[PDB]
Amino acid sequence: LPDPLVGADGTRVHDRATWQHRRRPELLQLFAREVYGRTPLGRPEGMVFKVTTMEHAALGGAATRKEVTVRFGRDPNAPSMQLLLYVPNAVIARAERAPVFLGLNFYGNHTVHTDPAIALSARWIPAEAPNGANHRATEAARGSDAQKWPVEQILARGYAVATVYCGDLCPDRPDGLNASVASWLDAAAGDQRAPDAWGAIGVWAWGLSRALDYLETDPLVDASRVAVHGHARLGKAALWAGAQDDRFALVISNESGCGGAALSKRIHGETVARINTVFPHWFARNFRRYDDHEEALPVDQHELLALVAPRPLYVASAEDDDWADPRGEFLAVKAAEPVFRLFGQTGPSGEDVPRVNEPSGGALRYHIRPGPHGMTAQDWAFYLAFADEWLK
Ligand SMILES: O=C(OCc1ccccc1)[C@H]1O[C@H](O)[C@H](O)[C@@H](O)[C@@H]1O
Ligand SMILES: O=C(O)[C@H]1O[C@H](O)[C@H](O)[C@@H](O)[C@@H]1O
Ligand SMILES: [Cl-]
Ligand SMILES: [Mg+2]
């Protein structure tokens, strides 16, 4: 592995200021140029927030539900995304602003809960979407992804729940960038995009920061206590959003795998060539230089993990998710751990993967659970306990 504490010019990093002001920028530029693609703008001038629905007694009175259209320019044809937010009414009643879990969803806001008041998504949805007809949402799709989205449990634990359909931002399909935030800004289609131009993971990540922009204006939530989380490909997005945007208070990667938390140079499970051929829209075209050539990579994913430091970072695996390379995810955490310890934070104790269902580490935390790829109640219990400790 490239040593996170040795700079690209061979300079060894021995102090927190050099990490922050020299090594971090260096790593951000390398991930942007060679891996994810460059994010071509931050907050758009002229972005508009419009609350389209609000219900103070949603979920049997447990929560206030808002839907917010976030439009990225004043042009009414500019792209937008639809933010679903649930705020726990008990917290509101104590005249307190709730901390927030924020993450993208795979198949639409209407899939995170059966709640029939959620607007069905009008956007293209992938064929794998349960109860989807002709790539469009259907009433039968309501709550179809609830397993990954314990909304009422999260609310009962004192957190707001914010989500956006990843396909509002970039449709998850090999040509999706052609109708996305990226094509709003860049008339190039397909593989005419610049080699260092962002792909779907960068667009998804950017959307998470725009959601945080909205949350900073919502009087019901505390935008300085946002945990950004994602599962699998959306966990890749959560990692890159949290690395680019240090406003996020805590980052959670649930089984994000190749190009997320897993070491690429391990060549275990999904490889760089495989991921770029199946998902040519996810990464920068420059990342294809490393197809069957991971040895030339100037970074590996322990350095993306390290870009969260010293903020709390939870990486987790599933024992039978070999395609994600669970031990490669653990070793990325261990290889990032020296940067966290530079800031006085600690990672997993000892040098090999902990027993299943036994989290290990302080602000840099890891667990592996039994079972197949997924996001389970046990995963969520561990994440909520982590947030309880780190979000005041
Ligand atoms: O398997 C897929 O593409 C395979 C492929 C086909 C033609 C050219 C290149 C690759 C897509 O399947 C779903 O649409 C997923 O949401 C999306 O991420 C995947 O790329
Ligand atoms: O998003 C998911 O569930 C996963 O889908 C595929 O398995 C892909 O190869 C993984 O990289 C991704 O993380
Ligand atoms: Cl619980
Ligand atoms: Mg792998």
Numbering used by the authors: 36 to 427
What does the paper say about this structure?
Glucuronyl esterases (GEs)4 are enzymes able to cleave ester linkages connecting lignin to glucuronoxylan in the plant cell wall. GEs belong to the α/β-hydrolase superfamily and possess a catalytic triad common with serine-type hydrolases. OtCE15A is an interesting member of CE15 and the α/β-hydrolase superfamily in that it features acidic residues at both the canonical and noncanonical positions (Glu-290 and Asp-356). Here, we have investigated by mutagenesis the residues involved in catalysis and carbohydrate binding in the enzyme OtCE15A and, furthermore, present a series of structures of OtCE15A with different ligands, including monosaccharides and, for the first time in CE15, di- and oligosaccharides.
To investigate the substrate binding in OtCE15A, we sought to obtain complex structures of the catalytically impaired S267A enzyme variant with GlcA and the model substrate BnzGlcA, respectively. Despite several attempts, we were unable to trap the Michaelis complex with BnzGlcA in our experiments as, presumably, the activity of the S267A variant was still too high to preserve the intact substrate in the active site even in short soaks (as short as ∼5 s). However, we were able to obtain a structure with GlcA bound in both active sites (for this particular complex, a crystal form with two molecules in the asymmetric units was used) and an additional BnzGlcA molecule near one of the active sites. The substrate molecule is located along the edge of the active site cleft, making only one hydrogen bond between its C3 hydroxyl and the carboxylate of Asp-207. Although making minimal interactions with the protein, its close proximity to the active site makes this interaction interesting, as it could indicate a mechanism for substrate recognition and a route into the active-site cleft. Attempts to trap the model substrate benzyl glucuronoate (BnzGlcA) in the active site were unsuccessful, although a structure was determined with BnzGlcA found in a site on the edge of the active site cleft that may indicate the route of the substrate prior to hydrolysis. In both OtCE15A and MZ0003, having the arginine in the active state likely aids in driving the forward cleavage reaction too efficiently to allow trapping of the Michalis complex even in the absence of the catalytic serine. The structures determined with BnzGlcA, found in a site close to the active site, and xylobiose, with the sugar found in a secondary site ∼25 Å from the active site, could indicate sites on the enzyme for interactions with longer glucuronoxylooligosaccharides.
